[PDB]
Design a protein around this ligand. Structure first.
Ligand SMILES: [Cl-]
Ligand SMILES: [Cl-]
Ligand SMILES: [Zn+2]
Ligand SMILES: [Zn+2]
Ligand SMILES: [Zn+2]
Ligand SMILES: [Zn+2]
Lengths: 53, 53
């Protein structure tokens, strides 16, 4: 038997271009700062970042 | 930036023992009939089944 269960998930946007991102450079210092790959390679953030997918 | 999004998913139980199942034998004929592996191997359903995980 199957039923529906409601749950949540995280959805990310690039803090710079405001676009939806799944692969993202995540700031290890800011609380809530992510960049798309293009913005990472264009306007680089002055904190250590990690690339998450 | 991250925010929460609400969404749903399917959760399955064994129609026989009523336990939660993730690996399950699914009836190809009934609309809503699943068996856990133990119940599949114990009280077999008189329809073709497929094993889903
Ligand atoms: Cl990159
Ligand atoms: Cl089996
Ligand atoms: Zn961007
Ligand atoms: Zn930062
Ligand atoms: Zn069962
Ligand atoms: Zn059946």
């Amino acid at each position: 038997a199957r039923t529906k269960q409601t749950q949540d998930r995280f959805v990310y946007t690039c803090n710079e271009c405001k676009h939806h991102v799944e692969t993202r450079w995540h700031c290890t210092v800011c609380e809530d700062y992510d960049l798309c790959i293009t913005c990472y390679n264009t306007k680089n953030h002055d904190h250590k970042m990690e690339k998450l997918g």
